[PDB]
Ligand binder design. Structure first.
Ligand SMILES: O=C(COc1cccc2cccnc12)NC[C@@H](O)CN1CCc2ccccc2C1
Ligand SMILES: O=C(COc1cccc2cccnc12)NC[C@@H](O)CN1CCc2ccccc2C1
Ligand SMILES: C[S@@+](CC[C@H](N)C(=O)[O-])C[C@H]1O[C@@H](n2cnc3c(N)ncnc32)[C@H](O)[C@@H]1O
Ligand SMILES: C[S@@+](CC[C@H](N)C(=O)[O-])C[C@H]1O[C@@H](n2cnc3c(N)ncnc32)[C@H](O)[C@@H]1O
Lengths: 322, 310, 303, 322
């Protein structure tokens, strides 16, 4: 619902590992779909969905000359300001191998179906940027045997102690809104002065394409965190993992973090009131992913060792616009 | 339409039972609109059902019918919404249906009834969490049991023992009963607790085996002796509401579900047949006594379907 | 005197039933807004497309009758916290639907059970409904003094009822309510419909409920004893509790069928009205303080 | 985006003139579309769009037996609670002459095109309930020569003095929102203790069906109100007029008010600061009707004899959900 600024694309294009990893994913996928004897006769149709300023288009081009295979490219981007950069790239450099499309991927009427869609629509909690809804509304133009890169993503949560961060959240009260709204929204934050109370556990998972007869993106999940010190719960760190293609992955889950990748910090889900946990106790939390035709949001509650209020009932404090 | 018969039949068909002579007993409720009631029907021509004009007999009941059963050849035992278990008697000419007793004994919807082997007693189950043993001749409750901890879903009398019946509840228990024991119920089922039990049928010969269906669409076969679950199959994609064995020597098992389908399984729970003929919940099945390959299902779509089973 | 309602889970014709219970003496009726057995389906074809009407029409009563005489009840198949995903989803949708209908009708109150430990999702759904428009109407949670599992007969050979000491366990039910109400952030719209049983639990368990928002007390016909002349009455203990509840001015609700057959349903009621008329008249302090109970004031500051 | 309560349909069904007027509109329209010699052979397809509890379906039925002409009816309603009433009407009374449809008129895939759509989706300022957007998304199932009833509606504004109402608005400050938000939203109000400073003037107008190649519902309009006393401007009364069919109309504009019709009170557009106007001066005001794919809203400003702040920039204080 907003458009990213030029300098925001700039900082993130500087990631070594993210794009090299996508190149390698596109590389392998091509080889698996067009055999050596077909190399000159089979031109794969590749679509980059939300192409920003083009690094994924370049990484597609590099993957095809590394696979020695042939590709047609579509670069769909809804941010018309980035569409400026793309259109200047395609006139000055790419030539007509790349068709730049300025529209929303849920709307675009595609002149042909794709062999592979490539997208990077992922937030620190995987699906919190609405990658599911975006790709769902695009998949109708993926061929029946089509590949989505990414194929899969999974979110994770771990409970944390940190009075520093609790206090930073509390300090985010604004005038003219609920005095406790600060506490009912997730923050991207480089968690530093904190204690992680239990190992992360998988939360929500999405697969692409989605072969469900009825597609439902809503979710309810219940996590039990064995805790073995005494402490105070202040929130939940979220992280994610995604399968780009086969064994090629991206991760910010500490146990399997992609080395050198700085593109995503962890996410923080606060709770309104600190809760005392004792050694030996289980922290039980519950997360829901919710939606309208207009917006998507999370709601969460702790149900053990003590209960909290349900956070963000109705998206009253935070939603993500569709 | 016969005398005393209602001009129109309640939309939601709940029950279908063939008498030995081959005539069709239908129970139906009105689960929506102004009047929430129920009715009982007899069809000597089974192919004429559900048309009210071509019935042998018919009658209005005060409240809906949650469950049904034949007593003998002329008795109809009814589980009512009203809290009542009622016995309806058939006509001498068999052209009208007459209330013999209406007992207001349960505190909530009576959801299940079964007639015990002799034909002189019955057990009912209610949402009021109770299970009750009836003297049909005396029109009284002999025994009242609060074994369960959530509403009762199904009660089934053993084929041959007046004092043995199965029950199953939303409290996750299947109870094997034997009223000869000081403590009558005994908890039975698979090793691990699973999905809630939703339907029961004794095997009509191996009087020590039963099947049970769960809320997840799985039909499972239990032995009381070896007191563990032998076989199981994922039959349905929604809860299994009824299980009916065929009259055959080695019997077939009809499986009916809220997934709107009928399935027919062999001894090993393998699929022989499946019918999507229905376009709403399938509530009952009976096998023709006259033609053992003929099977009748009814639904909330108001269809009475006669299936031919290989 | 005593405001009291009838709890029915079977209503063949609304006009008639309401007349019957009104004639009987009752101030209000608790009843289904959809047929309790009428399990609906929201996702999978074809049951999804079940032709309507989905229930009985609002035209059947005056606006005033809906506003004042009727308390809705959630359909008992709605299980938002079931372990089966398809049941959970239909239940969410069904709960919204019945909740929206009550609000559409303008019902003053609407009943929902807490009949197990985990009601997280029920809470989430209700909290959502609560924050979808601002309305006045109450949600009565129907909770028992004693949990069904701890009330059952000791009649399972291989699963005996535990006769040992359980101070905490006998309060499980309060925790069910405590947790639910915490999850729902103490909404002023959620109150207790306390279900009383044949066996009163220990006095401490009746201590728990002391300061809680009890708006109704549910009296099953099952718990009444019989006097010499066959009228329904209550054990000394149950009277004590009633007297405590009268002091808190809850509404009383009779549930279940008539078991004292040679008497009208109005006889249960007549006993209650007897109990309240037979309570000590308020002293002079209690007459003065009458309008002020839990009314919060600024202290006076005459300096 | 909300569903009307049973008692709200109840109060408004009690209007004598509104429905009698719709009956007469349907009556005339039938006669003009099916000639006497066709009376038994031509069955007109009639669609009631947003049928509530059915009075417009009954008024259609009464119009056809008054025209002695034959009609098929569809009753489309999105409020599933009212759809209860409709479905009980159609089983108990209407029979299969009426097909009750439970869906949004923008969504419904119609089994056939209509001769006439009938709707009552009008607010005190005509289009402030989104009648345009609703009917626009329906018209694709109106036959090429199809009639919409209403065919047309027009809003009106007049400036008013009233310190009473100014003070009533001011008193609508709530916690947790902009302290001046009260002033950036229109109120339905039976204007009583007020002074009307100038004759009402037409504001926005919509026609149905909309034969525009590109349909645009946004509007900008500039009104000049000659004022001839001294006073203080506190707001703008809005009213509306609509052509149901030909000469059959509904109006709450005082000069042409429909007698006995109580169904709409006037609407009030406040301004943040009272403005002093002198005899002989012109009050100039400016109204915009604005939109998203998600919402519709008004913004207004006074530009003479002095300027105000632009009210409701962006729908920051009030929108109507799509
Ligand atoms: O994890 C973070 C880190 O946030 C930041 C961290 C540090 C500097 C930032 C500057 C501008 C915006 N965000 C910054 N943000 C959320 C997550 O969506 C990051 N992705 C990373 C990938 C990417 C690629 C192109 C354009 C934007 C993005 C944003
Ligand atoms: O002009 C008013 C008068 O408002 C009211 C005035 C008096 C009582 C009311 C009670 C409930 C709701 N609104 C009331 N409201 C705005 C306008 O949309 C009125 N229309 C009038 C037509 C109509 C028909 C059916 C259902 C609703 C409506 C609402
Ligand atoms: C996080 S960025 C990544 C940009 C680029 N692929 C990169 O890695 O530098 C996601 C991009 O997708 C675009 N986008 C998001 N949703 C879209 C949609 N539904 N249709 C088209 N583009 C979309 C955004 O505007 C943004 O530029
Ligand atoms: C103001 S009411 C009038 C109701 C009725 N015609 C009458 O005059 O009593 C408008 C009705 O249209 C329904 N409605 C509004 N927008 C709709 C849409 N886009 N699709 C279907 N129904 C709609 C509303 O729910 C409401 O019941």
């Amino acid at each position: 619902m907003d458009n990213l600024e030029s300098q925001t694309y700039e900082v993130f294009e500087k990631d070594p590992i993210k794009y090299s990893q996508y190149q390698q994913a596109i590389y392998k996928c091509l080889l698996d779909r067009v055999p050596e004897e077909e190399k000159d006769t089979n031109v794969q149709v590749l679509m980059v969905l939300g192409a920003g300023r083009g690094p994924l288009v370049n990484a597609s081009l590099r993957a095809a000359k590394q696979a020695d295979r042939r590709i047609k490219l579509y670069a769909v981007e809804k941010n018309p300001n980035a569409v400026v950069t793309l259109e200047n790239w395609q006139f000055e450099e790419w030539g007509s191998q790349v068709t730049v499309v300025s529209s929303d991927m849920r709307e675009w009427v595609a002149p042909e179906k794709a062999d592979i869609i490539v997208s990077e629509l992922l937030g620190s909690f995987a699906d919190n940027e609405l990658s599911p809804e975006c790709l769902d509304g695009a998949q109708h133009f993926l061929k029946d045997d089509g590949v989505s890169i990414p194929g899969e993503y999974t979110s994770f949560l771990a409970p944390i102690s940190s009075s520093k961060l609790y206090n930073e959240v509390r300090a985010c009260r604004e005038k003219d809104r609920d005095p406790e709204a600060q506490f009912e929204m997730p923050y991207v934050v480089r968690l530093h002065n904190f204690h992680q109370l239990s190992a992360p556990q998988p939360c929500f998972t999405f697969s692409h394409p989605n072969r469900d007869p009825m597609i439902d993106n809503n979710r309810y999940c219940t996590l039990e965190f064995p805790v073995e010190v005494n402490t105070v719960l202040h929130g939940f760190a979220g992280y994610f993992e995604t399968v780009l293609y086969q064994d090629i992955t991206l991760s910010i889950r500490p146990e399997t973090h992609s080395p050198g990748m700085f593109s995503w910090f962890p996410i923080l889900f606060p709770i309104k009131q600190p809760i005392t946990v004792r050694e030996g106790q289980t922290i039980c939390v519950r997360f829901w992913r919710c939606s309208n035709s207009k917006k998507v949001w999370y709601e969460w509650a702790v149900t053990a060792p003590v209960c909290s209020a349900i956070h963000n009932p109705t998206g009253r404090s935070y939603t993500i616009g569709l | 339409l016969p005398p005393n018969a209602p001009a129109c039949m309640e939309r939601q068909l709940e029950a279908a039972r063939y008498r030995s002579d081959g005539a069709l007993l239908l129970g139906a409720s009105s689960l929506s609109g102004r009047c929430w009631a129920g009715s009982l029907w007899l069809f000597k021509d089974p192919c004429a059902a559900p048309n009210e004009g071509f019935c042998s007999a018919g009658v209005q009941t005060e409240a809906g019918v949650a469950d049904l059963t034949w007593v003998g050849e002329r008795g109809i035992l009814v589980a009512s919404d009203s809290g009542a278990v009622e016995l309806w008697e058939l006509d001498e000419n068999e052209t009208l249906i007459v209330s013999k007793f209406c007992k207001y004994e349960h505190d909530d919807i009576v959801s299940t009834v079964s007639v015990l082997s002799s034909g002189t007693q019955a057990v009912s189950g209610s949402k009021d969490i109770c299970i009750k043993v009836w003297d049909l001749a005396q029109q009284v409750v002999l025994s009242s049991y609060r074994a369960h901890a959530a509403q009762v879903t199904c009660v089934a009398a053993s084929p041959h023992k007046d004092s043995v019946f199965l029950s199953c509840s939303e409290d996750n228990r299947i109870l094997l009963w034997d009223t000869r024991c000081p403590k009558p119920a005994s908890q039975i089922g698979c090793s691990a607790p699973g999905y809630l039990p939703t339907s029961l049928a004794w095997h009509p010969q191996q009087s020590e085996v039963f099947v049970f269906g769960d809320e997840n669409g799985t039909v499972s076969l239990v032995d009381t002796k070896s007191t563990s679950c032998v076989l199981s199959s994922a039959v349905h994609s929604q809860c299994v509401t009824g299980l009916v064995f065929s009259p055959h020597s080695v019997p077939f098992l009809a499986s009916l579900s809220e997934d709107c389908s009928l399935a027919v399984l062999d001894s090993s729970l393998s699929e022989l047949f499946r019918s999507q003929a229905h376009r709403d919940f399938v509530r009952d099945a009976t096998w023709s006594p006259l033609n053992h390959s003929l099977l009748t299902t009814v639904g909330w779509d108001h269809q009475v379907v006669h299936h031919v089973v290989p | 005197r005593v405001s009291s309602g009838r709890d029915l889970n079977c209503v063949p014709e609304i006009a008639d039933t309401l007349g019957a219970v009104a004639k009987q003496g009752f101030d209000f009726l608790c009843m289904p807004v959809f047929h309790p057995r009428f399990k609906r389906e929201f996702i999978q074809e074809p049951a999804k497309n079940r032709p309507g009407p989905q229930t009985r029409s609002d035209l059947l009563l005056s606006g005033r009758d809906w506003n004042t005489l009727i308390v809705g009840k959630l359909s008992p198949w709605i299980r938002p916290d079931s372990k089966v995903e398809k049941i959970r989803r239909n239940s969410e949708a069904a709960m919204l639907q019945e909740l929206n209908f009550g609000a559409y009708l303008g019902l003053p109150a609407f009943l929902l059970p807490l009949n197990q430990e985990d009601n997280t999702n029920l809470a989430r759904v209700l909290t959502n409904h609560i924050h979808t428009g601002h309305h006045s109407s109450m949600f009565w949670m129907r909770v028992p003094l004693v949990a069904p599992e701890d009330l059952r007969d000791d009649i399972i050979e291989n699963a005996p009822t535990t006769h040992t000491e359980e101070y905490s366990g006998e309060e499980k039910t309060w925790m069910w309510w405590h947790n639910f109400r915490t999850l729902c952030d103490y909404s002023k719209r959620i109150a207790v419909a306390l279900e009383i049983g044949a066996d009163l639990p220990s006095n401490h368990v009746i201590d728990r409920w002391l300061g809680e928002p009890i708006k109704a007390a549910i009296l099953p016909t099952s718990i009444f004893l019989t006097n010499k002349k066959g009228f329904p009455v209550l054990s000394k203990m149950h009277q004590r509790l009633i007297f405590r509840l009268l002091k808190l001015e809850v509404q009383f609700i009779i549930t279940g069928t008539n078991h004292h057959s040679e008497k009208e349903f109005c006889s249960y009621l007549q006993y209650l009205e007897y109990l309240s008329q037979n309570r000590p008249p308020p002293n002079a302090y209690e007459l003065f303080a009458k309008g002020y109970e839990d009314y919060l004031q600024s202290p006076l500051q005459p300096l």
